[PDB]
Write a protein that binds this ligand. Structure first.
Ligand SMILES: *[C@@H]1O[C@H](CO)[C@@H](O[C@@H]2O[C@H](CO)[C@@H](O[C@@H]3O[C@H](CO[C@H]4O[C@H](CO[C@H]5O[C@H](CO)[C@@H](O)[C@H](O)[C@@H]5O)[C@@H](O[C@H]5O[C@H](CO)[C@@H](O)[C@H](O)[C@@H]5O)[C@H](O)[C@@H]4O)[C@@H](O[C@H]4O[C@H](CO)[C@@H](O)[C@H](O)[C@@H]4O)[C@H](O)[C@@H]3O)[C@H](O)[C@H]2NC(C)=O)[C@H](O)[C@H]1NC(C)=O
Ligand SMILES: *[C@@H]1O[C@H](CO)[C@@H](O[C@@H]2O[C@H](CO)[C@@H](O[C@@H]3O[C@H](CO[C@H]4O[C@H](CO[C@H]5O[C@H](CO)[C@@H](O)[C@H](O)[C@@H]5O)[C@@H](O[C@H]5O[C@H](CO)[C@@H](O)[C@H](O)[C@@H]5O)[C@H](O)[C@@H]4O)[C@@H](O[C@H]4O[C@H](CO)[C@@H](O)[C@H](O)[C@@H]4O)[C@H](O)[C@@H]3O)[C@H](O)[C@H]2NC(C)=O)[C@H](O)[C@H]1NC(C)=O
Lengths: 37, 37
C-alpha cells in the first residue's frame, strides 16, 4: 500500500514539475517576444 | 514511515501552493495593465 501510494505521488510530482516548467517557459516566451504580434 | 510520507506530501503542497500564488499574482498584474507598452 505504501509503495503504491509513493508511486502515485511520484507520478503526480513529475506531472506538476513538467507543467510548471511549461508554464514558466510560456511566460518567459511571451515576455521575450514583442507585444503587437 | 507515514510521518515521512506526510512530511513529503506537505512539502510538495507548500511549493505547489506558493507557485500558484506566484502565477496568479503575475496573471492579475498582466490583467490590470493594458497590453500595449
Ligand atoms: C523539478 O523542478 C525543479 C525546479 O525547481 C528542478 O530542479 C532544478 O532543475 C534544473 C534543471 O531543470 C537544475 O539546473 C541544472 O543546473 C546545473 C548546474 O549545477 C551546478 O551547480 C550545482 C549547485 O549550484 C547550486 O547553488 C548555486 C549557488 O552556489 C546556485 O546558483 C545554483 O542554481 C544551484 O542551486 C552543483 O551541484 C554541486 O553542489 C551541490 C551543493 O550546492 C551538491 O549537492 C552537488 O552534489 C554538487 O556537488 C553542480 O555540480 C553544478 O556545478 C546545470 O549543469 C550545467 O552546468 C554545469 C557546470 O556547472 C555543466 O557541467 C553542465 O554540463 C551543465 O551545462 C544543469 O544543466 C541544469 O541547468 C537545477 O539545479 C535544479 N534545482 C535543484 C535544487 O535541484 C528538478 O530537476 C525538477 N525535477 C525533475 C525530476 O526534473
Ligand atoms: C493554500 O491552499 C489552500 C487550499 O488549496 C488555500 O485555502 C483555500 O482558500 C480558498 C479561498 O481562497 C477556500 O475557498 C473558500 O471556501 C469557502 C467555503 O468554506 C466553507 O467550508 C469550510 C470548511 O471546508 C471544509 O469542508 C469542505 C467541504 O464543505 C472541503 O472542501 C474543505 O476542504 C474543508 O475540508 C468552513 O471552514 C470552517 O471549518 C474549518 C474546519 O474544517 C475551520 O477551520 C474554519 O475556521 C471554519 O470554522 C467555512 O467556514 C465555510 O463554511 C467559501 O465560502 C463560501 O461559502 C460560505 C458558506 O459555506 C459563504 O458564507 C461565503 O460567503 C462563500 O460564499 C469561499 O468563498 C472560498 O471559496 C478554500 O476552502 C481553502 N482551502 C482549505 C483547504 O482551507 C490557501 O489559500 C492556499 N494558501 C494561500 C497563501 O493562498
Amino acid at each position: 500500500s505504501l509503495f503504491q501510494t509513493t508511486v502515485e505521488l511520484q507520478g503526480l510530482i513529475d506531472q506538476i514539475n513538467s507543467t510548471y516548467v511549461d508554464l514558466k517557459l510560456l511566460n518567459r516566451f511571451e515576455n521575450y517576444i514583442k507585444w503587437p504580434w
